[PDB]
Structure 1
Amino acid sequence: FMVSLPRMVYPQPKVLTPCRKDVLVVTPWLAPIVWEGTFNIDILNEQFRLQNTTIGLTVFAIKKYVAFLKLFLETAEKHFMVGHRVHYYVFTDQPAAVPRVTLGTGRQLSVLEVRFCERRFLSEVDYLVCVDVDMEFRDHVGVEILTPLFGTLHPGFYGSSREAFTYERRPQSQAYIPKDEGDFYYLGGFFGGSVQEVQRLTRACHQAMMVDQANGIEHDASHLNKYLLRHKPTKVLSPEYLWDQQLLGWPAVLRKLRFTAVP
């Protein structure tokens, strides 16, 4: 049950004026492709606040990567889902090395040591967002991404033909994608969706990985890409949501760099 939106004043959408004339803003299966300019965040924020949405943000910070947590969480506090309930889950082998970062109200952090758990996510959050920790939020990352299942366009392949995508190409692998298949090349550093859809993804990925290991063949990205080929995501994030400015600059087609590699 979705309650009524309030009165809001904003510019009328123009049916005969395309949103962007430089990029694809919807997939062939009618999933939006989220670029700056495609969304009114005020409408979306209302929609998700009225549902009292809670978002889990999972990071794995092992060994030397704990060094990146401080900048990651600090910048998340400024840019990630500001205004909504956020639950950080930091998986680490060094719980004591996790920095004390000050969190805004309605936001919490759990440290989970690694050397009825998945069940925990189902009762605690509505969506899960899984990302790499050696990263920095530089601009808005908000509820526009939220959907049952989403992937993010790999920043070095978003203009490439499918032949050039570095999918798994060996037929013996469960991640195998032939040269004549593939919609996009998704990167493993930013994906998510509902808790249910994310658990299905990681479960299917874990089983495919074990089958490959059993067949003497050896990763994350290739399996994610196979999964999202066969289970089309309900939104697709533009490379705004995972960029490397040192490696790729700031091209015109990116009006914002939201989430980036660290110099």
Structure 2
Amino acid sequence: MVSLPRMVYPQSKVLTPCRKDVLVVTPWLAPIVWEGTFNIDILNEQFRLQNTTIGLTVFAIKKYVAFLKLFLETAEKHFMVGHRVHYYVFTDQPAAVPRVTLGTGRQLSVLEVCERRFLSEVDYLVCVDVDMEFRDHVGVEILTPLFGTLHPGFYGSSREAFTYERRPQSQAYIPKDEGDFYYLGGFFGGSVQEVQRLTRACHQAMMVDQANGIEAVWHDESHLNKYLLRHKPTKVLSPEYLWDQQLLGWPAVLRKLRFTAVP
């Protein structure tokens, strides 16, 4: 709760939008994080003064353990650098986890495949897929109670085109006239409490679907979209945060490609 120290930075012009090519705030007043919308120095101050600890979770089973080295090494270069980080690697091959050199204040836990642990060890949880690599800054600008990430292939599409689950028989059902954005199942997070609420909710919904003999079109992702539609995220990350340059190239609208799929 302490006050920020004296800081010197350029003034923001009230009569000058920061980005004139994209939407930077949702209808429920949640910021949409694009390069240029934030001053990382101010945000780093706020979060360091709180001695914020960020948990980063990834599941690496079978052949996916092969992606851990690059994932962890690039995260060390771009993920929450300067802040306390705790990586949680869930895997069926504990011995196959690469020994990556970590910066100070950063640790890694290998869990073989304990929620109570999270509440006690980190302030925020970030959940992503392992077959990725960081290519640019991914920092505290994303931290908030609950956040979703705009899917790179649908940020410019009409909602009718969103690949939401369209069957009323599914708990993830979302009609053609509903929906704000199409979020990625591979990059979401927020406070431990909000994240556990989301996963707990999606777990129950998927069980209901299973019992009813139905499986959502895009599984976990379909349910995450239903959850975020009914519980608006406090921050929305732009496609900068999960991109696939091989399939989508590098649009002018993207000033940075921070987290990407591995070819």
Same-fold status (TM-score > 0.5): yes
Matched, 1:249 2:249: yes
C-alpha displacement at 1:67, in angstroms?
A: 0.2
Q: Distance in 2 between matches of 1:20 and 1:77?
A: 29
Q: Distance in 2 between matches of 1:105 and 1:18?
A: 38
Unaligned ranges ≥5, structure 1: none
C-alpha displacement at 1:167, in angstroms?
A: 0.1
Q: For 2:228, what is the secondary structure of its paired residue?
A: helix
Matched, 1:168 2:165: yes
C-alpha displacement at 1:129, in angstroms?
A: 0.1
C-alpha displacement at 1:110, in angstroms?
A: 0.2
Q: Distance in 2 between matches of 1:41 and 1:197?
A: 24
C-alpha displacement at 1:158, in angstroms?
A: 0.3
Q: Distance in 2 between matches of 1:208 and 1:189?
A: 18
Q: For 1:57, what is the secondary structure of its paired residue?
A: strand
C-alpha displacement at 1:141, in angstroms?
A: 0.1
Could you list the per-position Cα deviations for residues 132-161 of structure 1 after superposition, in whole angstroms to 9, with x for gaps in the alignment? Answer: 000000000000000000000000000000
Q: For 1:188, what is the secondary structure of its paired residue?
A: coil
Q: For 2:119, what is the secondary structure of its paired residue?
A: helix
Query: What's the TM-score once normalised by structure 2's chain length?
Result: 0.99
Q: Distance in 1 between matches of 2:12 and 2:24?
A: 15
C-alpha displacement at 1:65, in angstroms?
A: 0.2
Q: Distance in 2 between matches of 1:221 and 1:162?
A: 16
Matched, 1:41 2:40: yes
Could you list the per-position Cα deviations for residues 178-206 of structure 1 after superposition, in whole angstroms to 9, with x for gaps in the alignment? Answer: 00000000011110000000000000000
Q: Distance in 1 between matches of 2:172 and 2:222?
A: 6
Could you list the per-position Cα deviations for residues 57-104 of structure 1 after superposition, in whole angstroms to 9, with x for gaps in the alignment? Answer: 000000000000000000000000000000000000000000000000
Query: What's the TM-score once normalised by structure 1's chain length?
Result: 0.99
Could you list the per-position Cα deviations for residues 98-136 of structure 1 after superposition, in whole angstroms to 9, with x for gaps in the alignment? Answer: 00000000000000000xx10000000000000000000
Q: Distance in 2 between matches of 1:193 and 1:38?
A: 19
Match runs of 1:59-138 below 5 Å: 59-114=58-113, 117-138=114-135
Name the % identity: 99
C-alpha displacement at 1:221, in angstroms?
A: 0.7
C-alpha displacement at 1:217, in angstroms?
A: 0.3
Q: Distance in 1 between matches of 2:150 and 2:9?
A: 30
Q: For 2:185, what is the secondary structure of its paired residue?
A: strand
Could you list the per-position Cα deviations for residues 35-77 of structure 1 after superposition, in whole angstroms to 9, with x for gaps in the alignment? Answer: 0000000000000000000000000000000000000000000
Unaligned ranges ≥5, structure 2: none
Q: Distance in 2 between matches of 1:190 and 1:214?
A: 27
How many positions carry a matched residue from both structures?
Answer: 260
Q: For 1:167, what is the secondary structure of its paired residue?
A: coil
Q: Distance in 1 between matches of 2:244 and 2:186?
A: 12
Could you list the per-position Cα deviations for residues 212-249 of structure 1 after superposition, in whole angstroms to 9, with x for gaps in the alignment? Answer: 00100011110000000000000000000000011100
C-alpha displacement at 1:177, in angstroms?
A: 0.1
Q: For 2:117, what is the secondary structure of its paired residue?
A: helix
Q: For 1:186, what is the secondary structure of its paired residue?
A: coil
Q: Distance in 2 between matches of 1:250 and 1:111?
A: 35
C-alpha displacement at 1:209, in angstroms?
A: 0.2
